[PDB]
Amino acid sequence: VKPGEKFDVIIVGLGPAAYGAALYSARYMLKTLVIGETPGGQLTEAGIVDDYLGLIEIQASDMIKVFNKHIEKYEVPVLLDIVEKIENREFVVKTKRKGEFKADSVILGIGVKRRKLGVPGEQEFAGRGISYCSVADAPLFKNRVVAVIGGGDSALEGAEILSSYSTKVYLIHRRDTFKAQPIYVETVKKKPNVEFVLNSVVKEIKGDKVVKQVVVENLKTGEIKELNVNGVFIEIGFDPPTDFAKSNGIETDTNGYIKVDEWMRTSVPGVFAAGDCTSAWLGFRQVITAVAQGAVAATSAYRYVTEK
Amino acid sequence: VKPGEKFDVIIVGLGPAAYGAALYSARYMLKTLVIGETPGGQLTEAGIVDDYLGLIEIQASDMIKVFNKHIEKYEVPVLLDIVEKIENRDEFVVKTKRKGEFKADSVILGIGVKRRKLGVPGEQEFAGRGISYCSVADAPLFKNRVVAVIGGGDSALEGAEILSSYSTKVYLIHRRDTFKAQPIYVETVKKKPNVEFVLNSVVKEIKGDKVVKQVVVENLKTGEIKELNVNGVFIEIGFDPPTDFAKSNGIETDTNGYIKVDEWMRTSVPGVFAAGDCTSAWLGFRQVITAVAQGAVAATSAYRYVTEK
Ligand SMILES: Cc1cc2nc3c(=O)[nH]c(=O)nc-3n(C[C@H](O)[C@H](O)[C@H](O)COP(=O)(O)OP(=O)(O)OC[C@H]3O[C@@H](n4cnc5c(N)ncnc54)[C@H](O)[C@@H]3O)c2cc1C
Ligand SMILES: Cc1cc2nc3c(=O)[nH]c(=O)nc-3n(C[C@H](O)[C@H](O)[C@H](O)COP(=O)(O)OP(=O)(O)OC[C@H]3O[C@@H](n4cnc5c(N)ncnc54)[C@H](O)[C@@H]3O)c2cc1C
């Protein structure tokens, strides 16, 4: 593809939502272009995916490869770049390096960016005991001692599921209280194998070939503890693309996510959204639901383009 | 499993939505039981599925096999039977036709819908040999071929619209003087130079040799009988939601007879969730991917409900 080319739909992103939307957009015979920065999106940080029905215990890297093969069967052009602006003048989609493209409709599958922690040992033990998704990996830590870092809904829900599989969960958070919804806190509080480690931070993640310990510091007392753990789940949340939405005149909900209706329509006619950047099923971040929302957004774009 | 046993969640159905809910329910460590009549649900009548991302060109029968394999990896017990009633006591009592009754803290309904039957001569004979019940699924296979779409609602009109982008010509056949589809769909399709409306008409027969070759059509006004050469026939006459089952079990339905759910797949009865084609969510869009995703959402709502309880 070249700058200035016009498409029926431009899909922004290259994660599950974008792949799901591209598959349906191409099969609807919409001239489709996908522009995304990172192939696979959040899946680039995942290990094995075993909750996408029908792809049993698949390495996330292989899931990305087969999702790409599926849309390439339909010859969907994929441009690796960052979309900076979406202007209505038809739409003109401006990219950082590869020019401006035109479209009758746009589907945003831009996801959310993981809030970074960055503690010593985190890079060293990537894929070696550290996980960024408790609901995905909890089944892999049956009868192991684990730590969850975080204090919102993501971390409390993570501690709840890990409490079911694991020996014990140390739930570590830097504040004096959790910010999670009260029922999540109360539910986890009643688990005898979950220990709250409030007012604390992880100073270091240590191990040999795999994670073996976390050094924890209490910010109020200075007390330092070394906990022996086999897994560390970093669950500090994700940042929605509020700035991108605001910059491009797209409404966001009061949580900062792109507001969509049932049919994945944003506040801008002709612009749809799918996946975890949206307000739909907020808080539930899964491959299957992003792929499904992509199918719905493609169907809404199809109806919009054909009726236009 | 044995009668009287209690589960955290009982999933009714064995189609995409129930498999999707069972996979998540098992992964949340919910004590799960699946009771369903037909493994695969509507997939038992599908051909090749090429719109479930990541399972490229999978035969529907192979998709049922791998969906089953996936939940059995989690040792989810599956009972092949019909659920006759869901009694709301404190807890639910799910009554089956042949396996006794079971108790549950929550229930997920993935009971789907039933395809309305046309029943024209040649239809059952040419199943899988030129007849399709899903335009969105099969349209890509009819590029540069001639097809007929039978029906008059939204699915037939949108089916014709999609097929017009692949096929050389599309005959849209319906027995009434007008279509009952949203006017916008009718107006949009009418402009296609390759779509021909064949209103006030019925198909008398679907004919072929090894595969579909013709449809015999009768015009109900003029009485004229004519044969149209076609490579494919897409029957798009709708589905029947389980309104009776919903009413029987005290579950509210939407204005179209589907199980009313909110965003999180909650029905009007606390502790009862629903997923897939039987629900009011994304009405009209009936796909494997969306049923499997709604199953995951219903399982998560059941998980939250049970853990809170
Ligand atoms: C470590 C980890 C493991 C996980 N494991 C599982 C699992 O096993 N099962 C499961 O169901 N879920 C899992 N998840 C959750 C799941 O991966 C996400 O819910 C899902 O990937 C969301 O898909 P998405 O397409 O909406 O967004 P993302 O995956 O966030 O992808 C967004 C895409 O948009 C691109 N993008 C963003 N902004 C721009 C821009 N301006 N221009 C161009 N491109 C842009 C990104 O580069 C990326 O390609 C996991 C998440 C993490 C972090
Ligand atoms: C011919 C055909 C081809 C299709 N092709 C495609 C395609 O290529 N791609 C695509 O994405 N979609 C396709 N679809 C649509 C897709 O199959 C459906 O959207 C999907 O199967 C719906 O799944 P579900 O689980 O909600 O319902 P269903 O598949 O309808 O399953 C409902 C389940 O509930 C069971 N059940 C119902 N009542 C009871 C009861 N009282 N007790 C116990 N069990 C009960 C049924 O036996 C069944 O197991 C096709 C549909 C048809 C009819």
Side-chain angles (χ1 to χ4, degrees):
Chain A
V1 296
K2 276 85 182 171
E5 190 172 350
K6 189 164 175 174
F7 296 87
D8 290 321
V9 65
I10 288 177
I11 293 167
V12 183
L14 198 54
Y19 289 120
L23 177 59
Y24 272 73
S25 291
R27 288 173 41 86
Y28 283 130
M29 272 307 298
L30 292 166
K31 186 183 176 196
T32 303
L33 169 69
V34 177
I35 308 173
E37 181 182 15
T38 303
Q42 288 171 59
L43 291 175
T44 61
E45 297 193 303
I48 299 169
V49 182
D50 199 34
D51 57 8
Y52 186 87
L53 186 74
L55 289 176
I56 299 173
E57 296 165 347
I58 189 167
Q59 291 292 320
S61 60
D62 290 322
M63 170 172 273
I64 293 165
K65 288 172 185 183
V66 77
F67 285 179
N68 176 255
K69 283 172 185 295
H70 207 161
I71 66 159
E72 296 305 81
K73 174 183 159 165
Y74 291 96
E75 301 174 37
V76 174
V78 174
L79 178 70
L80 303 180
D81 203 3
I82 294 164
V83 167
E84 311 252 61
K85 209 72 187 197
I86 296 172
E87 283 161 22
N88 189 314
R89 183 124 173 219
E90 66 185 347
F91 293 100
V92 173
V93 177
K94 302 182 171 185
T95 70
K96 185 177 163 187
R97 162 191 46 173
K98 312 186 173 173
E100 283 185 358
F101 301 87
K102 298 165 181 186
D104 274 339
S105 65
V106 175
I107 298 173
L108 303 178
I110 60 176
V112 296
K113 271 197 155 182
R114 181 166 64 70
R115 293 180 187 128
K116 285 182 190 173
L117 189 67
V119 291
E122 187 172 357
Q123 269 185 34
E124 171 172 23
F125 292 99
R128 305 160 85 84
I130 301 174
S131 170
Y132 294 103
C133 190
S134 301
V135 299
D137 298 330
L140 306 185
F141 290 81
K142 290 172 191 215
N143 295 313
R144 302 297 177 216
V145 175
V146 301
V148 172
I149 303 177
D153 287 356
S154 301
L156 275 289
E157 289 183 68
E160 166 66 31
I161 187 176
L162 287 160
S163 80
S164 297
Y165 283 92
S166 303
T167 299
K168 178 179 182 182
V169 180
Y170 287 98
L171 176 54
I172 306 164
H173 180 52
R174 65 185 179 179
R175 307 306 189 185
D176 193 61
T177 57
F178 292 112
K179 65 181 164 180
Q181 303 191 60
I183 186 60
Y184 288 161
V185 179
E186 295 308 301
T187 295
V188 176
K189 191 187 144 178
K190 282 159 170 165
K191 301 292 187 186
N193 70 328
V194 175
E195 175 172 326
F196 288 168
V197 188
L198 286 158
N199 294 303
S200 303
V201 294
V202 168
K203 287 192 125 199
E204 169 178 23
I205 296 169
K206 317 200 313 187
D208 55 308
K209 297 177 298 176
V210 297
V211 171
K212 291 181 159 174
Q213 294 183 295
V214 293
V215 178
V216 179
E217 164 152 45
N218 184 303
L219 299 178
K220 286 193 168 181
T221 74
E223 174 190 49
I224 297 287
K225 319 179 185 161
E226 274 205 68
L227 301 173
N228 295 309
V229 298
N230 308 295
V232 177
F233 293 79
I234 298 169
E235 297 274 9
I236 61 163
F238 290 76
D239 288 327
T242 316
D243 293 340
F244 178 93
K246 290 194 176 186
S247 168
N248 292 291
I250 294 160
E251 278 183 22
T252 51
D253 69 2
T254 49
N255 306 296
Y257 287 73
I258 293 173
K259 185 67 175 75
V260 294
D261 66 8
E262 181 182 340
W263 292 102
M264 298 300 120
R265 291 178 286 214
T266 72
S267 63
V268 176
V271 180
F272 309 87
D276 50 36
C277 70
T278 74
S279 61
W281 292 333
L282 191 180
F284 189 51
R285 298 183 182 97
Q286 305 291 321
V287 179
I288 190 74
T289 52
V291 175
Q293 289 176 331
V296 176
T299 298
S300 294
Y302 173 73
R303 290 166 179 176
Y304 174 88
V305 168
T306 61
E307 287 164 30
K308 172 195 186 183
Chain B
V1 296
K2 266 78 187 193
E5 185 174 1
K6 184 166 188 175
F7 296 81
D8 292 320
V9 62
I10 292 180
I11 295 169
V12 185
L14 199 51
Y19 288 119
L23 176 59
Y24 272 69
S25 68
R27 286 175 50 86
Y28 286 132
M29 274 185 64
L30 290 176
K31 186 182 172 183
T32 309
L33 171 63
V34 176
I35 306 166
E37 184 185 14
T38 302
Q42 291 171 56
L43 287 177
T44 61
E45 296 191 294
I48 306 303
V49 178
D50 203 33
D51 57 9
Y52 186 86
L53 186 75
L55 287 181
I56 301 170
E57 289 176 15
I58 190 169
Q59 287 263 42
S61 58
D62 290 325
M63 173 174 268
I64 298 170
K65 289 185 194 198
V66 74
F67 286 179
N68 179 256
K69 178 177 176 152
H70 203 164
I71 67 164
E72 293 308 71
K73 196 176 67 86
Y74 282 92
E75 300 179 16
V76 174
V78 176
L79 291 176
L80 298 181
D81 199 8
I82 291 164
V83 166
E84 302 290 1
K85 203 78 173 60
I86 294 168
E87 171 181 48
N88 188 349
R89 184 171 191 182
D90 174 58
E91 72 193 349
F92 298 98
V93 180
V94 175
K95 308 175 178 183
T96 72
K97 177 173 181 163
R98 310 191 57 154
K99 277 57 218 300
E101 319 187 331
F102 302 92
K103 291 179 161 150
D105 278 315
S106 65
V107 176
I108 296 172
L109 304 175
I111 60 175
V113 296
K114 310 275 185 73
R115 181 171 62 72
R116 292 176 190 141
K117 302 188 173 185
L118 186 62
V120 297
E123 183 179 356
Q124 47 185 24
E125 289 70 28
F126 286 98
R129 300 191 286 155
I131 291 178
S132 172
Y133 295 102
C134 192
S135 299
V136 301
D138 294 329
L141 303 174
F142 288 81
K143 185 176 182 178
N144 298 312
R145 296 160 85 191
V146 177
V147 299
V149 177
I150 306 181
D154 289 342
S155 70
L157 269 293
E158 189 165 70
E161 174 89 354
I162 301 163
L163 281 158
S164 76
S165 294
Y166 286 103
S167 301
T168 304
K169 188 179 177 93
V170 181
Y171 292 106
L172 175 53
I173 305 171
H174 179 54
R175 68 197 170 189
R176 309 297 186 167
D177 187 56
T178 57
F179 293 114
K180 58 191 181 178
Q182 297 172 49
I184 181 58
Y185 291 155
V186 175
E187 297 308 291
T188 300
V189 172
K190 205 173 191 172
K191 303 201 173 212
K192 301 293 184 174
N194 67 332
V195 176
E196 180 183 315
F197 289 173
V198 186
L199 286 155
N200 299 300
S201 297
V202 296
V203 174
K204 297 305 187 195
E205 180 182 22
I206 293 171
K207 306 192 317 177
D209 190 11
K210 288 194 301 205
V211 299
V212 168
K213 287 175 168 174
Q214 289 182 305
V215 286
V216 179
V217 178
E218 178 199 349
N219 182 294
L220 301 183
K221 291 206 157 191
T222 69
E224 162 203 62
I225 292 287
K226 64 164 99 166
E227 288 199 52
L228 299 173
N229 293 320
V230 294
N231 300 279
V233 178
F234 284 76
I235 299 170
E236 296 279 14
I237 62 160
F239 297 77
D240 291 326
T243 310
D244 291 346
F245 181 95
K247 278 169 180 169
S248 167
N249 295 286
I251 297 160
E252 286 173 22
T253 52
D254 68 6
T255 61
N256 297 293
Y258 287 75
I259 290 170
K260 172 45 204 192
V261 293
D262 65 7
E263 154 162 45
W264 289 98
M265 297 304 116
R266 307 184 187 158
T267 72
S268 65
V269 178
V272 181
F273 308 87
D277 285 10
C278 71
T279 76
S280 59
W282 295 327
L283 212 192
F285 195 49
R286 303 180 175 92
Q287 304 291 309
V288 181
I289 188 71
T290 57
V292 176
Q294 291 172 336
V297 179
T300 305
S301 292
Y303 170 61
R304 292 172 178 175
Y305 176 87
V306 175
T307 64
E308 284 187 34
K309 183 183 179 183

